[PDB]
Design a protein around this motif. Structure first.
Motif, PDB file in Angstrom:
ATOM      1  N   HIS C   8      -1.221  -2.426  -8.045  1.00  0.00           N
ATOM      2  CA  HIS C   8      -0.880  -3.628  -7.306  1.00  0.00           C
ATOM      3  C   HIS C   8       0.549  -4.086  -7.506  1.00  0.00           C
ATOM      4  O   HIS C   8       1.206  -4.456  -6.537  1.00  0.00           O
ATOM      5  CB  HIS C   8      -1.831  -4.757  -7.696  1.00  0.00           C
ATOM      6  CG  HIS C   8      -3.252  -4.489  -7.324  1.00  0.00           C
ATOM      7  ND1 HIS C   8      -4.125  -3.828  -8.157  1.00  0.00           N
ATOM      8  CD2 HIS C   8      -3.945  -4.773  -6.198  1.00  0.00           C
ATOM      9  CE1 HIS C   8      -5.301  -3.726  -7.567  1.00  0.00           C
ATOM     10  NE2 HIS C   8      -5.218  -4.291  -6.376  1.00  0.00           N
ATOM     11  N   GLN C  20       3.655   1.395  -6.570  1.00  0.00           N
ATOM     12  CA  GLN C  20       4.133   0.501  -5.521  1.00  0.00           C
ATOM     13  C   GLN C  20       5.438   0.961  -4.895  1.00  0.00           C
ATOM     14  O   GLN C  20       5.751   0.546  -3.777  1.00  0.00           O
ATOM     15  CB  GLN C  20       4.306  -0.916  -6.056  1.00  0.00           C
ATOM     16  CG  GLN C  20       3.017  -1.635  -6.297  1.00  0.00           C
ATOM     17  CD  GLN C  20       2.285  -1.894  -5.006  1.00  0.00           C
ATOM     18  OE1 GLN C  20       2.879  -2.181  -3.982  1.00  0.00           O
ATOM     19  NE2 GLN C  20       0.953  -1.801  -5.063  1.00  0.00           N
TER      20      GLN C  20
ATOM     21  N   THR D   1     -11.123  -2.938  -2.243  1.00  0.00           N
ATOM     22  CA  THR D   1     -10.114  -3.824  -1.679  1.00  0.00           C
ATOM     23  C   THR D   1      -9.150  -4.303  -2.756  1.00  0.00           C
ATOM     24  O   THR D   1      -8.814  -3.560  -3.675  1.00  0.00           O
ATOM     25  CB  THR D   1     -10.755  -5.038  -0.986  1.00  0.00           C
ATOM     26  OG1 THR D   1     -11.548  -5.765  -1.932  1.00  0.00           O
ATOM     27  CG2 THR D   1     -11.627  -4.590   0.173  1.00  0.00           C
ATOM     28  N   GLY D   2      -8.703  -5.551  -2.640  1.00  0.00           N
ATOM     29  CA  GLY D   2      -7.741  -6.102  -3.561  1.00  0.00           C
ATOM     30  C   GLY D   2      -6.301  -5.832  -3.201  1.00  0.00           C
ATOM     31  O   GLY D   2      -5.406  -6.424  -3.814  1.00  0.00           O
ATOM     32  N   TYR D   3      -6.046  -4.964  -2.231  1.00  0.00           N
ATOM     33  CA  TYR D   3      -4.693  -4.661  -1.798  1.00  0.00           C
ATOM     34  C   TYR D   3      -4.189  -5.593  -0.714  1.00  0.00           C
ATOM     35  O   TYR D   3      -3.083  -5.385  -0.213  1.00  0.00           O
ATOM     36  CB  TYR D   3      -4.608  -3.229  -1.281  1.00  0.00           C
ATOM     37  CG  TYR D   3      -4.830  -2.192  -2.337  1.00  0.00           C
ATOM     38  CD1 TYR D   3      -3.828  -1.870  -3.236  1.00  0.00           C
ATOM     39  CD2 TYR D   3      -6.039  -1.521  -2.429  1.00  0.00           C
ATOM     40  CE1 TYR D   3      -4.025  -0.918  -4.203  1.00  0.00           C
ATOM     41  CE2 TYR D   3      -6.245  -0.564  -3.393  1.00  0.00           C
ATOM     42  CZ  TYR D   3      -5.235  -0.266  -4.277  1.00  0.00           C
ATOM     43  OH  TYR D   3      -5.437   0.691  -5.243  1.00  0.00           O
ATOM     44  N   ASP D   4      -4.966  -6.601  -0.327  1.00  0.00           N
ATOM     45  CA  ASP D   4      -4.600  -7.435   0.809  1.00  0.00           C
ATOM     46  C   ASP D   4      -4.638  -8.919   0.478  1.00  0.00           C
ATOM     47  O   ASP D   4      -4.808  -9.742   1.379  1.00  0.00           O
ATOM     48  CB  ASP D   4      -5.502  -7.137   2.002  1.00  0.00           C
ATOM     49  CG  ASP D   4      -6.962  -7.280   1.678  1.00  0.00           C
ATOM     50  OD1 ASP D   4      -7.314  -7.462   0.493  1.00  0.00           O
ATOM     51  OD2 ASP D   4      -7.779  -7.224   2.620  1.00  0.00           O
ATOM     52  N   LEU D   5      -4.496  -9.280  -0.789  1.00  0.00           N
ATOM     53  CA  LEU D   5      -4.509 -10.688  -1.144  1.00  0.00           C
ATOM     54  C   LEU D   5      -3.111 -11.283  -1.104  1.00  0.00           C
ATOM     55  O   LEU D   5      -2.880 -12.292  -0.437  1.00  0.00           O
ATOM     56  CB  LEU D   5      -5.129 -10.868  -2.526  1.00  0.00           C
ATOM     57  CG  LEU D   5      -6.597 -10.469  -2.597  1.00  0.00           C
ATOM     58  CD1 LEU D   5      -7.105 -10.592  -4.013  1.00  0.00           C
ATOM     59  CD2 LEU D   5      -7.415 -11.323  -1.661  1.00  0.00           C
ATOM     60  N   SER D   6      -2.172 -10.663  -1.796  1.00  0.00           N
ATOM     61  CA  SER D   6      -0.804 -11.143  -1.839  1.00  0.00           C
ATOM     62  C   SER D   6       0.040 -10.459  -0.777  1.00  0.00           C
ATOM     63  O   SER D   6      -0.321  -9.414  -0.233  1.00  0.00           O
ATOM     64  CB  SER D   6      -0.189 -10.897  -3.214  1.00  0.00           C
ATOM     65  OG  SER D   6       1.174 -11.268  -3.219  1.00  0.00           O
ATOM     66  N   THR D   9       2.237  -6.900  -2.286  1.00  0.00           N
ATOM     67  CA  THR D   9       1.619  -5.624  -2.608  1.00  0.00           C
ATOM     68  C   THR D   9       1.521  -4.780  -1.351  1.00  0.00           C
ATOM     69  O   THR D   9       0.999  -5.243  -0.335  1.00  0.00           O
ATOM     70  CB  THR D   9       0.223  -5.817  -3.187  1.00  0.00           C
ATOM     71  OG1 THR D   9      -0.629  -6.353  -2.172  1.00  0.00           O
ATOM     72  CG2 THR D   9       0.255  -6.784  -4.350  1.00  0.00           C
ATOM     73  N   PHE D  10       2.007  -3.547  -1.421  1.00  0.00           N
ATOM     74  CA  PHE D  10       1.751  -2.610  -0.345  1.00  0.00           C
ATOM     75  C   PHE D  10       0.328  -2.082  -0.433  1.00  0.00           C
ATOM     76  O   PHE D  10      -0.341  -2.165  -1.464  1.00  0.00           O
ATOM     77  CB  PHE D  10       2.721  -1.438  -0.392  1.00  0.00           C
ATOM     78  CG  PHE D  10       4.097  -1.773   0.069  1.00  0.00           C
ATOM     79  CD1 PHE D  10       4.387  -1.831   1.415  1.00  0.00           C
ATOM     80  CD2 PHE D  10       5.107  -2.002  -0.840  1.00  0.00           C
ATOM     81  CE1 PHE D  10       5.655  -2.126   1.847  1.00  0.00           C
ATOM     82  CE2 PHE D  10       6.377  -2.296  -0.414  1.00  0.00           C
ATOM     83  CZ  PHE D  10       6.651  -2.360   0.931  1.00  0.00           C
ATOM     84  N   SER D  11      -0.130  -1.521   0.672  1.00  0.00           N
ATOM     85  CA  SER D  11      -1.394  -0.814   0.711  1.00  0.00           C
ATOM     86  C   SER D  11      -1.198   0.583   0.147  1.00  0.00           C
ATOM     87  O   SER D  11      -0.069   1.054   0.016  1.00  0.00           O
ATOM     88  CB  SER D  11      -1.890  -0.754   2.147  1.00  0.00           C
ATOM     89  OG  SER D  11      -1.039   0.071   2.921  1.00  0.00           O
TER      90      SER D  11
END
Lengths: 204, 239, 240, 240, 238, 228, 250, 232
Positions: C8, C20, D1-6, D9-11
């Motif tokens: 992350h 990243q 998931t977790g890659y789309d909260l902030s 952060t890239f996917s």
């Protein structure tokens, strides 16, 4: 003036393989002595001294800030300081107060520690270092001390005749000054021992 | 600038970091204090000596002024910075109002220092409790204690640290009026109390009396050996 | 291969990797676009395509060629919003060189200042490290032309032939066979060998409306953008 | 998931979903189209009557940034008029420092960098608005720009933002805006937003038009009432 | 749900839930109804209490001589904006020596409340301001929301059980732009009897009325002077 | 797992403001009654140990000469709000040369009660009663951890709150006297506390229009107990 | 942003705190230092860790740092964290000397550093220092002193202490062989080589594997002397001569 | 904006700083590099392979001078190296503006390593991913120092960093002694980089810098081909 508020006189002179430094003993306020044992020459390691003259506050203040920076230098590094390096250290310390300046004029004398070679220099109150090969003077009675040293200094002098020259240079120039006197202490250093003498001067 | 709420409410209304800090107090060594009508007596137990250390650097009874002593329990790292902030405040009182600091005043400084510190950002609360003992002006001996949440609280006799419920249950069946009759008789209450705790058979106890006009006076382990003899000698003959 | 929040933010994996940044190199490829830069004996040519899908869009505002200083131009790949912000830094850093130091900035010293800024994003665990690339050309005295690439990892190097984008690996395999036969390169040959790079990789055989060519030369060191009429001059001479 | 909260952060394939999620909030706002004529720009906003209780002239989705620059928005209205404040404030500092009215290629550049700056950090969110800018100058002609929530700007001969975006710009390219003056345009702007949003989803709606050019002497203002009543006279002739 | 913790985080559908949860806070407060004529602006509130001996919580506040507001939500956030509201009216009166226009006041509120809806660790303001005032253009009825999206309107109602009050206003708003202050108020009082259970209505201790008027400074009426307005209403038909 | 300290519920209220309402159900109970003759105001002490000094704790504390207070819930953070109320009444006296009224003291504290966050850290877990006599007669107010205050006539706050509020609605009327309002409150405290009622478990304080804030002590207090 | 925070400052539900106990777990391994005093003089015996055959062996010492003109310290733990603490209390002693014009007492130098070290365990959201360290020195108020610091921030005076990898094995043997106030600075040197003979698993006591420095009081000197590698091995074999006699005669 | 202000490097329950352990794995995956001091000067050598023929090898440099007499190489990742070079360029200048003397090589490593320790404890940063080799001839005697991402430093006679460093250090142990010249140290430093290189070691695959009493300098590729000749 401000430099004439307490008086003072510091002289250093270069010999053959030795160097001597001398200063007065009077502490006073403009007309009136207070004591005759005021220290003006401070040790900075072995075989390396410094003399301060000018305002009696900044004599005691700069000699404590300089000792503060010196002990941190000799513990961060594993060696003693060269005589040339201390001249750059003091000139940094005075120039930081470019517009709040300390009213003193240092005189540095000592031997180089590896090759035992003498070194003398002097600085103004904002730190313009001037190295010479014969003598440096600082204090209120400066012009009296130039007439002594220009007429008495010789190029290659053993520590016996070096003591006799710097004694007669101080006892006659300070005697002509009004706010300087009350005794003269003379340090003469060399690579084997070190010698401190006090002269019989006029207490007048 | 580390800005994070450390102490927050629970879903049933508690402050978890406060009551977790009260368990750090619950495994520090035991400190007991009673007050007589003319001389106060407080003394820690469980010195836990290892006979290779300097005995003065391990002390937990210190003085804030001439008249105010202080004992504590919990973790000693947070203790001696609360003390050094309390020494400054009780000194700056003298630059103000000319009389020396009353013993009630200095506990309000400590408890209010300890409370707002469970309120700020990015600070865990303190993990100590205290006993502040002093005989103020007009010679009124009294004592207080300090919860880690910051509630100053006066007492007649108290005990904090590891094994504090058993000692407090021991004092309620033992604190009479005539137990504080003589100055050497109130000390026989404390040495009987700490012996009813973690063992401390004359080798782990350190009392410190104050006779309302002197400073603190630590007796060396010879009178404690003399007192523990006669405290057992009365128990030797009655039963 | 992963432990903690290393997927992350920009911290280390157990293998020594950090994900990243290498997730951000393939954010360049989402543009669907490829640019080629070739250095010559006395010139340097950037060629890149443009994809205009609509007739309603103004075709004069989709230029990826940017004029950094009067003698330094650049092309941008990657995502558009981060690429245009990075051009704003390079115009700003070049003006402060001239004000502080009193002469025109060299192109490698400019690329060093861009890569140092991009290094900080992959150095703090808070910022997102700007998934777009950077290719500069320029004329330097006693060095001739020279080309530099800056990637969002903070790395940079001087090249002799350069590709960036979706078809990067196929184009560099083309150019390294072209350069190691050691032909001399005039002005028109470098333009011909840069158009025929992506004309054979992409296999388009286009008309002069889809590409755009910037150039610099040691007879006119101004960064200039070619007209569609004179692109057509090179393009019909390419089909012998 | 977790890659789309902030938004920092890239996917694992290299794209930011917090920007793409914020783009999805634009397709719940209704429709805002704007095309530029030969000698001016005409905006057009169809406006939903949510209930009878609101006032005719409430909550305008069509702003006024400078004396000559106009703005039409589509998105989350609290973020729209927040961008309208800094764009109005940016044009003031241009005139107070440089003395003259701000051009559009610079004005949309300064705003889009401010929008781009919120797609880098975890401390802020991206804006939920897309909008358009149009103006006219006597030394520059008409301009028409558009800014997405990512921070990408381009020029257009006509654009559309809202729910039915493709269904609106299908009919824009049927027009010939290169030659029409901004009088016949006003009837044709209103017609293409009548064929959209069938009466099944919405009960009633409101036309809102805007207007700039040398016929308005360079100033931006709303259309008069009589001209837009001609366009609403030109309403019910699309049923043939 | 992990998308439901902070104001910054967007939903995959594109709806920030922390804004939508602050809309639930204004649905918990008691109802209030504002409406306007050609020359007057009347807002009517409905107080609540906790026990029968505690007093009723007031809702209508005096901002300036020509501006009054009505609150719905948590009251501590209401005083935080009300003190901002008073401050922005009297410094414009300090500088320009004129009453600050109503439509230009609310644009300051929408910029004030939008800032914490975009930072990190900042809640939205849960409050439901209905604003009634005077420009030089006559009366104005405005509402705001915690989503920082203010609405120009001619009659609205917000608070708990407010949908029944809106249905009364839609079928009677053809009459509002003609009548004087007497049946303008008891049009609005017939909206508050709609939003109540079927046994108690208007017992002169839970209702407050505020009027700003074309020659009338903004005035709040409380529980004794309500009785001239409150009389003359028919019984609830059942 | 971990929310912030500044997060709304899906039902819409908050979390830690609602959690602090639960925290004041653990404090000692407190009863205040507004009567036109004056405000009486009482509390229990909840003595834990026989060795404890009883008078060292207090719940009634005064703000000014004409305003008293009563606290519940936590105690250690109540001392912050009391000190802000004392300074606020002195700044009002300094600049306006008069006494601040009882209502305007309360909103000066209630504006402080909801100011936690992550800039410039948790709500206050106390609940207060304010008894005072300003120029509108005797007053009685009650604030909240949420910052909500309202004038009450007879409010009961503490762990035995809803048990006392039921028994307090049946004895109160608008025409009480202060001598019997004191006697009426001690009957309620006698029912709800654990230990037997004496002159040490409780304390009272009244404010009259004539004299200033007066707090009872262990000599004039037990005549009401023996004549209960 | 609050999802990535590790909360290095809060308590544990059992009352203690985890973060310094992990650091005091790391202070167990990686090093061995010990001190002893009973009379005129005090010594630090430290065991070198990197004994690879390609090093220069310079900077006058490895784990011994001269702090003041009349005191020094031995360190253990994370060596990078060690260098920052050393030149932090090195100028605490100088700003004392600048203020009072007198050398600092050895005890209140330790309390000054251990307040800095305590603050990282208490606020700031910061990794603590994984460094524990000894203190020898002299002052005119109590003479020769010996202190020990901890990463938690609490100190203590001692007479003999080791913080080695088998420190608990050493302390159990130090309180089996001692005498209060009679171990002069030759029996203390003889007892030092006996203790690290045991706690070092590498046998035979290579003279380059250890470091010994003494602090003896000369009239205005307070000589801090790191004794060279020519008089270590004669002290090694002096232990080795008597142990063959003491075993065979028993 | 602002920062994070919390350390993301904590102690494991086993008592190991895990991020520093992972940063050393990035150092071990770097390009190999050797460094040998021999009795009059220090030889630094590194290994520089371009990925293709398109790169201009005379554009960037691994071996960097810090002052007149101090050079510096690395083995780690690229962009982290250029940060603490520019930091070390400045630290030699604030020493010179005070003391009017070139900085000793020991005092430079005091201040570069104190940056990296300060950088592995502060808030919101990951540590560096490079190790360093620092040479210089101050007061006659040469020096050779090695730092790490943790912040420690050492004083080596000869060492190797990068890939196969455990094979390089065994090779130097069987070859190095106390008595070598500078040009003898060059021939044994190319001989140890040949243990892990590719097939051809030309004049541009390596990069060698030396110190003398005349000061630090970096070898041009002309005489690097001369040393690469008559090798192995």
């Amino acid at each position: 003036s401000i430099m004439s508020y307490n008086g003072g006189a510091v002289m250093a002179m270069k010999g053959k393989n030795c160097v001597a430094i001398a200063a007065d003993r009077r502490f006073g306020i403009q007309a009136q002595m207070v004591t005759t044992d005021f220290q003006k020459i401070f040790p900075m390691g072995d075989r390396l001294y410094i003399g301060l003259a000018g305002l009696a506050t900044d004599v005691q203040t700069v000699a404590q800030r300089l000792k503060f920076r010196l002990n941190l230098y000799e513990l961060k590094e594993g060696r003693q300081i060269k005589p040339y390096t201390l001249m750059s250290m003091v000139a940094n310390l005075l120039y930081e107060k470019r517009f709040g300046p300390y009213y003193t004029e240092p005189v540095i004398a000592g031997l180089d520690p590896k090759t035992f070679k003498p070194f003398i220099c002097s600085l103004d109150l904002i730190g313009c270092p001037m190295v010479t090969d014969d003598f440096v003077v600082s204090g209120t009675c400066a012009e009296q001390m130039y007439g002594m040293c220009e007429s008495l200094w010789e190029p290659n002098m053993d520590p016996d005749h070096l003591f006799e020259t710097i004694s007669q240079a101080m006892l006659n120039a300070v005697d002509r000054d009004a706010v300087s006197g009350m005794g003269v202490i003379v340090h003469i250093i060399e690579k084997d021992k070190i010698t401190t003498r006090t002269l019989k001067a006029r207490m007048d | 600038s580390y800005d994070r709420a450390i102490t927050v409410f629970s879903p049933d209304g508690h402050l978890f970091q406060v009551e977790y800090a009260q368990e750090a107090v619950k495994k520090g060594s035991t400190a007991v204090g009673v007050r007589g009508r003319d001389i106060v007596v407080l003394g820690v137990e469980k010195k836990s000596v290892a006979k290779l250390q300097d005995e003065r650097t391990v002390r937990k009874i210190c003085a804030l002024d001439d008249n105010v002593c202080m004992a504590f329990a919990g973790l000693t790292a947070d203790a001696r910075i609360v003390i050094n902030r309390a020494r400054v405040e009780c000194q700056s009182h003298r630059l103000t109002v000319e009389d020396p600091v009353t013993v009630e005043y200095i506990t309000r400084y400590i408890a209010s220092l300890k409370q707002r510190y469970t309120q700020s950002n990015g600070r865990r609360p303190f993990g100590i409790s205290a006993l502040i003992v002093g005989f103020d002006f007009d010679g009124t001996p009294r004592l207080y204690q300090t919860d880690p949440s910051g509630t100053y609280h006066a007492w007649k006799a108290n005990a904090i640290g590891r094994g504090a419920k058993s000692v407090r249950e021991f004092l309620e069946k033992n604190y009479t009026d005539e137990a504080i009759e003589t100055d050497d008789l109130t000390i026989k209450l404390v040495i009987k109390a700490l012996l009813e705790v973690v063992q401390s058979g004359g080798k782990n106890i350190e009392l410190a009396v104050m006779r309302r006009d002197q400073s603190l006076k630590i007796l060396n382990p010879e009178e404690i050996e003399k007192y523990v003899a006669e405290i057992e000698k009365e128990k030797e003959e009655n039963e | 291969s992963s432990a903690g929040f290393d997927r992350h933010i920009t911290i280390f994996s157990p293998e020594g990797r950090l994900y990243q940044v290498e997730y951000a190199f393939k954010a360049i490829n989402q543009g669907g676009l490829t640019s080629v830069a070739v250095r010559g004996k006395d010139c340097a040519v950037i060629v890149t395509q443009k994809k205009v899908p609509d007739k309603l869009l103004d075709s004069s505002t989709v230029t990826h060629l940017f004029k950094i200083t009067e003698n330094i131009g650049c092309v941008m790949t990657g995502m558009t919003a981060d690429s245009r912000s990075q051009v704003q830094r390079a115009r700003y850093e070049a003006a402060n060189w001239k004000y502080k130091y009193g002469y025109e900035i060299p192109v490698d010293m400019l690329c060093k200042r861009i890569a140092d800024i991009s290094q900080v994003y992959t150095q703090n665990a808070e910022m997102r490290p700007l998934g777009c690339c950077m290719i500069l050309i320029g004329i330097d005295e006693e060095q001739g032309p020279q080309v530099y690439k800056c990637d969002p990892a903070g790395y940079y190097c001087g090249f002799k032939a350069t590709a960036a984008g979706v078809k990067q690996t196929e184009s560099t395999s083309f150019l390294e066979k072209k350069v190691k036969k050691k032909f001399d390169w005039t002005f028109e040959q470098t333009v011909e060998t840069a158009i025929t790079c992506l004309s054979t990789v992409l296999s388009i055989d286009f008309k002069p409306s889809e590409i755009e060519v910037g150039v610099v030369t040691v007879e006119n060191p101004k960064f200039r953008i070619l007209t569609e009429a004179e692109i057509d001059a090179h393009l019909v001479a390419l089909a012998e | 998931t977790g890659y789309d909260l902030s938004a920092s952060t890239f996917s694992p394939d290299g794209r930011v979903f917090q920007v793409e999620y914020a783009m999805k909030a634009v397709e719940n706002s209704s429709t805002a189209i704007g095309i530029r004529c030969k000698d001016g720009v005409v905006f057009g906003v169809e406006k939903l009557v949510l209930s009878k209780l609101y006032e005719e002239g409430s909550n305008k989705r069509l702003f006024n940034v400078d004396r000559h620059v106009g703005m039409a928005v589509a998105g989350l209205l609290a973020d729209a008029r927040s961008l309208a404040d800094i764009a109005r404030e940016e044009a003031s500092n241009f005139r107070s420092n440089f003395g003259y009215n701000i051009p559009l290629k610079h004005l949309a550049d300064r705003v889009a960098m401010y929008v781009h700056a919120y797609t880098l950090y975890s401390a802020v969110r991206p804006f939920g608005c897309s909008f358009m800018l149009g103006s006219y100058s006597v030394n520059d002609g008409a301009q028409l720009y558009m800014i997405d929530p990512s921070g990408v700007s381009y020029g257009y001969w006509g654009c559309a933002i809202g729910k039915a975006r493709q269904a609106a710009k299908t009919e824009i390219e049927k027009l010939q805006m290169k030659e029409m003056t901004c009088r016949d345009i006003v009837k044709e702007v209103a017609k293409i937003i009548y064929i959209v949003h069938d009466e099944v989803k919405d009960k009633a709606f409101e036309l809102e038009l805007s207007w700039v050019g040398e016929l308005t002497n360079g100033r931006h203002e709303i259309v008069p009432k009589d001209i837009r009543e001609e366009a609403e006279k030109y309403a019910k002739e699309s049923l043939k | 749900n992990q998308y439901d913790n902070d104001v910054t985080v967007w939903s995959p559908q594109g709806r920030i839930h922390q804004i939508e949860y602050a809309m639930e806070a204004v649905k918990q407060g008691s109802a209030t109804v504002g409406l306007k004529s050609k020359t007057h602006a009347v807002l009517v509130a409905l107080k609540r209490a906790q026990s029968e001996l505690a007093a009723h919580q007031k809702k209508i506040l005096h901002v300036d001589n020509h501006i009054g507001i009505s609150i719905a939500g948590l009251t501590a956030d209401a005083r935080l904006l009300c003190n901002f509201m008073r401050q922005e009216c009297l410094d414009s009166r300090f500088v320009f020596d004129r009453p600050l226009p109503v439509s230009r006041l609310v644009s300051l509120i929408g910029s004030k409340t939008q800032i914490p809806t975009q930072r990190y660790g900042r809640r939205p303001y849960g409050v439901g301001l209905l604003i009634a005032g005077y420009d030089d253009m006559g009366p104005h009825i405005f509402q705001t929301c915690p989503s920082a999206n203010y609405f120009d309107c001619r009659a609205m109602s917000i608070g708990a059980r407010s949908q029944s009050a809106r249905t009364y206003l839609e079928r009677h708003m053809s009459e509002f732009m003609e009548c004087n202050l007497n049946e303008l108020v008891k049009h609005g009082l017939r909206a508050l009897r709609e939003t109540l259970p079927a046994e108690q209505d208007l017992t002169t201790k839970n209702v407050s009325i505020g009027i700003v008027g074309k020659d009338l400074e903004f005035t709040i009426y409380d529980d004794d002077d309500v009785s001239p307005f409150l009389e003359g209403l028919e019984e609830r038909p059942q | 797992y971990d929310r912030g300290v500044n997060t709304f519920s899906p039902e819409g209220r908050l979390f830690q403001v609602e959690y602090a309402i639960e925290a004041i159900k653990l404090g000692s109970t407190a009863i205040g009654i507004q009567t036109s003759e004056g405000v009486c105001l009482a509390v229990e002490k909840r003595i834990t140990s026989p060795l404890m000094e009883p008078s060292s704790i207090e719940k009634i504390v005064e703000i000014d000469a004409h305003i008293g207070c009563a606290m519940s819930g936590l105690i250690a953070d109540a001392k912050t709000l009391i000190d802000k109320a004392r300074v606020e009444t002195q700044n009002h006296w300094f600049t306006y040369n008069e006494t601040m009224t009882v209502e305007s003291v309360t909103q000066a504290v209630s504006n402080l009660a909801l100011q936690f966050g992550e800039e410039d850290s948790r709500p206050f877990g106390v609940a207060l009663l304010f008894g005072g006599v300003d120029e509108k007669g005797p007053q009685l107010f009650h604030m909240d951890p949420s910052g909500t205050f309202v004038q009450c006539d007879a409010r009961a706050i503490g762990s035995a709150s809803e048990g006392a509020q039921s028994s307090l609605q049946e004895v109160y009327h608008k025409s009480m006297t202060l001598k019997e309002a004191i006697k009426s409150s001690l009957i309620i405290l006698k029912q709800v506390m654990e230990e037997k009622l004496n002159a040490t478990n409780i304390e009272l304080a009244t404010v009259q229009p004539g004299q200033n804030f007066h707090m009872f002590t262990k000599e004039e207090l037990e005549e009401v107990i023996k004549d209960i | 942003s609050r999802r990535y925070d590790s909360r290095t400052t809060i308590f544990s539900p059992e009352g203690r705190l985890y973060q310094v106990e992990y650091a005091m777990e790391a202070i167990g391994h990686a090093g061995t230092c010990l001190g002893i005093l009973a009379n005129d003089g005090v010594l630090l015996a430290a065991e070198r860790r990197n004994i690879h055959k390609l090093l220069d062996e310079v900077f006058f010492s490895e784990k011994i740092y001269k702090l003041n003109e009349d005191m020094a310290c031995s360190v253990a733990g994370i060596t990078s964290d060690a260098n920052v603490l050393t030149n932090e209390l090195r100028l605490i002693a100088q700003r004392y000397l600048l203020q009072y014009q007198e050398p600092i007492p050895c005890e209140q130098l330790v309390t000054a550093l251990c307040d800095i070290k305590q603050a990282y365990t208490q606020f700031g959201g910061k990794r603590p220092f994984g460094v524990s360290l000894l203190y020898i020195g002299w002052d005119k108020h109590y003479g020769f002193q010996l202190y020990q610091s901890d990463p938690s921030g609490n100190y203590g005076g001692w007479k003999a202490t080791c913080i080695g990898n088998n420190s608990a094995a050493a302390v159990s043997m130090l309180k089996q062989d001692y005498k209060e106030g009679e171990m002069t600075l030759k029996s203390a040197l003889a007892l030092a080589i006996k203790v690290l003979n045991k706690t070092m698993d590498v046998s035979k006591l290579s003279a380059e594997k250890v470091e010994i420095a003494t602090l003896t009081r000369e009239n205005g000197k307070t000589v801090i002397r790191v004794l060279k590698q020519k008089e270590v091995e004669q002290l090694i074999k002096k232990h080795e001569e008597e142990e063959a006699k003491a075993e065979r005669e028993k | 904006e602002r920062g994070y202000s919390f350390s993301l490097t904590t102690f494991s329950p086993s008592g190991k700083l895990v991020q520093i352990e992972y940063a050393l794995a990035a150092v071990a995956g770097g390009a190999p590099s050797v460094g040998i001091k021999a009795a009059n000067g220090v030889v630094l050598a590194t290994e520089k392979k371009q990925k293709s023929i398109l790169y201009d090898e005379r554009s960037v440099h691994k071996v960097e001078p810090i002052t007149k007499h101090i050079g510096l190489v690395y083995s780690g990742m690229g962009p982290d190296y250029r940060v603490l070079v520019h930091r070390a360029r400045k630290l030699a200048q604030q020493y010179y503006l005070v003391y009017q003397e070139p900085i000793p090589t020991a005092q430079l490593v005091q201040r570069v390593a104190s940056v990296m320790q300060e950088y592995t404890q502060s808030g919101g940063v990951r540590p560096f991913g490079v190790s360093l080799l620092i040479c210089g001839w101050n007061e006659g005697r040469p020096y050779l120092f090695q730092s790490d991402p943790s912040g420690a430093y050492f004083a080596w006679k000869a060492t190797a960093m990068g890939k196969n460093y455990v094979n390089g250090k065994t090779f130097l142990e069987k070859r190095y002694n106390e008595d070598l010249e500078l040009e003898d140290a060059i021939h044994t430093a190319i001989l140890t980089l040949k243990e892990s290189f590719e097939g051809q070691m030309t004049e541009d695959n390596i990069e060698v810098g030396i110190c003398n009493e005349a000061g630090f300098r970096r070898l041009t590729p002309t005489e690097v081909k001369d040393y690469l000749a008559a090798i192995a």
